[PDB]
Amino acid sequence: PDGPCVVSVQETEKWMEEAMRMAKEALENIEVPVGCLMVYNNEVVGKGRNEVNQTKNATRHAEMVAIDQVLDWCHQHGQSPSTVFEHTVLYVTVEPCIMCAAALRLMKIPLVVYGCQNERFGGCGSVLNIASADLPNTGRPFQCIPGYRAEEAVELLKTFYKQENP
Amino acid sequence: QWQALPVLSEQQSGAVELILAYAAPVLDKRQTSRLLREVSAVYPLPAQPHLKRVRPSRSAGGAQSSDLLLCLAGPSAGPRSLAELLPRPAVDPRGLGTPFLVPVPARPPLTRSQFEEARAHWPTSFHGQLFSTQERAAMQTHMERAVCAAQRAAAQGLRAVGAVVVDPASDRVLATGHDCSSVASPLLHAVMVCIDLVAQGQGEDSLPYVCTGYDLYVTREPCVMCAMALVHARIQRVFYGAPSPDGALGTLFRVHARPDLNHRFQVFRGILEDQCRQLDPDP
Ligand SMILES: [Zn+2]
Ligand SMILES: [Zn+2]
């Protein structure tokens, strides 16, 4: 078993309650309400919410922001990215899209805790299962812990699309 | 001397679809050699080279006639006379009868299972050409530009993968980029770099779907991360040289041709392929 994964998994309630707070942050900022944390050894290493409309760029999903924050946190502390990502647990409101699933594979993340399903674009099962897929040249497959506080997380999407065009 | 071959949906790739065409019977079978010359010159049917142009008939009894494949049918497929369809004196039509409509298969059959299925509506051969020959030079100098960029990358010690983003309205190069993946920054594939270039070059009021309308030329086929990015960004067309082993626009996925994503776009493969075969693959 990974040592920094089991330690990070323990305060899962704590990391989600902040992951949710970040989705409420993105909601009231007219963003798709997804927020995530990346925990390396019971310490937040990158955070991130959806920044799509803000940057006028659509690749800036929450998960892709955080990956950049953790590559920074690697660079300031001069640690190689391989030895940090491979022991990092990602906490995200919503099953990662088909794109972010591929990034996490390439970063060799090992584990993801998500809330509610992702019917529109989900790459963890819903549309394609990129996470467990056999992609020999696209990083390392990773496993998922679905469902954590999904009801709260989905009532955030429902109240984003009946609000985008009534 | 390269061809650009569309990559179509999982479903749409294995079916035989038909289009309406006008044929006409040959009554004077000795004008056949002649009428073939005179007609397939006016209407050469470039989009459809798989279609033998004379269909033999047999009568229960053994009466051998033929019908000549004339031309494609207009959007209002009513009956059309010989004079309407065959201009003179390009075509001395004598020897032909009144023209009828006939379903003929729209695309060259790829498997033998489609071939026997197409043949049943109109004869066809086994074992097309899509663009103008000035647009074929448009894509020429753009793929070249992406190979020129790909090689720059390998020379420095980077994934030999290059990409340009062209606005087809003006054939203006909007972004040139190659893979920039480093140990500190592993997600800078050529395609991801080109998007972030595009996005920073746009005014205050701009949609976040930063690729709408634009073309993309990549040396080899995008990975999953890249391909989906082009979906979220709403690219219009994508031309690549050779496939990639984990490619998401042909090889292991076709994310451009799905109902489930909010967006769908054309993918062509083979542009300047012989060059790109030796470039590196995404990722
Ligand atoms: Zn995503
Ligand atoms: Zn890629």
Side-chain angles (χ1 to χ4, degrees):
Chain A
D2 273 348
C5 292
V6 320
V7 178
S8 301
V9 160
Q10 301 300 317
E11 308 237 55
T12 277
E13 186 43 41
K14 174 195 185 177
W15 307 134
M16 269 296 183
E17 173 55 43
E18 166 85 344
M20 275 282 297
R21 175 204 75 87
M22 301 232 51
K24 301 182 178 166
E25 184 177 290
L27 191 47
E28 281 185 331
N29 275 29
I30 321 106
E31 290 285 347
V32 202
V34 178
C36 67
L37 295 201
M38 281 184 73
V39 184
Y40 175 75
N41 259 319
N42 212 81
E43 163 174 340
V44 179
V45 162
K47 327 189 201 266
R49 55 158 182 96
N50 240 51
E51 283 181 3
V52 172
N53 314 317
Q54 166 177 327
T55 177
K56 290 143 218 300
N57 171 345
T59 86
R60 295 272 81 196
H61 288 157
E63 316 92 304
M64 290 279 323
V65 159
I67 291 184
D68 276 323
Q69 264 187 27
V70 175
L71 295 154
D72 298 344
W73 193 95
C74 279
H75 192 68
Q76 303 148 27
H77 306 44
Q79 310 201 353
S80 68
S82 328
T83 53
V84 174
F85 276 79
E86 293 187 22
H87 304 274
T88 306
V89 182
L90 159 70
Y91 289 76
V92 50
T93 276
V94 161
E95 170 195 356
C97 65
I98 292 190
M99 171 195 207
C100 317
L104 299 156
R105 277 186 75 92
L106 293 163
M107 298 311 309
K108 304 187 251 79
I109 286 297
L111 172 76
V112 179
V113 181
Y114 58 90
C116 68
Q117 292 298 105
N118 181 335
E119 287 197 308
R120 273 167 194 74
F121 308 114
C124 280
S126 303
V127 179
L128 295 165
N129 169 258
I130 306 306
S132 300
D134 172 51
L135 306 169
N137 309 111
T138 304
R140 145 171 342 158
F142 59 96
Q143 305 84 43
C144 297
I145 298 199
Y148 200 86
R149 278 171 77 174
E151 268 206 344
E152 288 185 63
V154 72
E155 285 281 70
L156 280 174
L157 300 175
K158 287 196 233 186
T159 75
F160 161 82
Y161 293 107
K162 204 193 68 179
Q163 285 202 349
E164 199 193 9
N165 283 275
Chain B
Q1 198 234 14
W2 53 256
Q3 278 204 345
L5 317 158
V7 170
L8 310 162
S9 170
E10 198 76 63
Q11 310 299 297
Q12 266 127 352
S13 280
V16 170
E17 279 173 338
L18 312 171
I19 34 173
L20 293 179
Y22 290 106
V26 290
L27 315 164
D28 182 5
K29 267 180 294 165
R30 307 193 213 280
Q31 319 297 334
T32 304
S33 265
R34 176 183 69 85
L35 282 163
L36 192 37
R37 272 188 302 267
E38 319 219 323
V39 176
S40 53
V42 172
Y43 294 103
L45 290 182
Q48 300 89 355
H50 50 308
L51 295 184
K52 319 242 174 204
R53 258 170 180 283
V54 304
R55 177 181 67 185
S57 313
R58 172 174 304 278
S59 115
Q64 303 190 345
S65 55
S66 1
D67 316 293
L68 180 66
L69 194 29
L70 260 51
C71 78
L72 283 179
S76 162
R80 297 268 181 291
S81 85
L82 268 185
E84 299 169 4
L85 304 182
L86 295 178
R88 237 173 308 180
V91 178
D92 170 36
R94 297 174 297 184
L96 292 181
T98 336
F100 57 107
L101 282 164
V102 50
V104 294
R107 308 188 294 272
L110 316 171
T111 65
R112 212 213 296 151
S113 180
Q114 312 172 294
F115 160 51
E116 317 208 19
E117 235 286 286
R119 209 172 30 83
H121 302 98
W122 199 266
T124 206
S125 34
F126 198 23
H127 298 115
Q129 176 72 228
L130 280 96
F131 294 95
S132 105
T133 21
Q134 76 167 358
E135 300 168 325
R136 274 186 93 275
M139 323 156 185
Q140 188 63 50
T141 317
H142 292 329
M143 198 66 244
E144 285 170 358
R145 181 157 187 82
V147 182
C148 285
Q151 294 172 297
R152 213 174 313 140
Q156 310 171 20
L158 288 146
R159 283 304 256 167
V161 169
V164 322
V165 169
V166 171
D167 175 2
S170 51
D171 208 56
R172 168 173 74 270
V173 180
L174 275 190
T176 316
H178 56 54
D179 186 285
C180 288
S181 298
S182 67
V183 161
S185 281
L187 299 178
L188 302 174
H189 309 166
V191 200
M192 300 293 301
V193 159
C194 281
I195 297 177
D196 279 15
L197 287 191
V198 170
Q200 81 185 2
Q202 57 181 187
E204 169 91 352
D205 211 354
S206 278
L207 272 125
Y209 305 83
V210 308
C211 281
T212 357
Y214 300 160
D215 293 345
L216 162 80
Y217 304 74
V218 283
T219 67
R220 280 178 101 173
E221 181 187 2
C223 73
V224 160
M225 190 210 202
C226 296
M228 193 61 192
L230 299 145
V231 167
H232 286 303
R234 282 178 188 174
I235 201 62
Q236 182 91 89
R237 321 201 296 260
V238 170
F239 309 97
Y240 60 92
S244 290
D246 294 14
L249 301 179
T251 289
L252 291 200
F253 295 94
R254 301 102 173 291
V255 318
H256 61 296
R258 297 180 81 89
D260 27 55
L261 318 191
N262 199 33
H263 191 64
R264 161 131 60 172
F265 63 88
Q266 280 173 333
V267 165
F268 299 105
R269 72 143 277 182
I271 290 81
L272 233 182
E273 166 147 3
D274 36 56
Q275 206 127 352
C276 302
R277 314 185 177 273
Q278 311 117 316
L279 301 168
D280 298 344
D282 205 313

Coordinates of all heavy atoms in Angstrom, one line a residue, chain B residues 189 223 226 282, ligand 2:
Chain B
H189 N 2.0 18.7 -24.7 CA 2.0 18.1 -26.0 C 1.7 19.2 -27.1 O 1.3 20.3 -26.8 CB 1.0 17.0 -26.1 CG 1.0 16.0 -25.1 ND1 0.0 15.1 -24.8 CD2 2.0 15.7 -24.1 CE1 0.4 14.3 -23.8 NE2 1.6 14.7 -23.4
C223 N -3.3 12.2 -28.9 CA -3.6 11.3 -27.8 C -5.0 11.6 -27.3 O -5.7 12.5 -27.8 CB -2.6 11.4 -26.7 SG -2.8 13.0 -25.7
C226 N -5.1 15.4 -25.8 CA -5.2 16.3 -26.9 C -6.6 16.3 -27.6 O -7.2 17.3 -27.8 CB -4.1 16.1 -27.8 SG -2.4 16.3 -27.2
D282 N 2.0 11.0 -30.5 CA 1.3 11.5 -29.3 C 0.7 10.4 -28.6 O -0.1 9.6 -29.1 CB 0.2 12.5 -29.7 CG -0.1 13.6 -28.7 OD1 -0.3 13.1 -27.5 OD2 -0.2 14.8 -29.0
Ligands
ZN2 ZN -1.3 14.5 -26.5

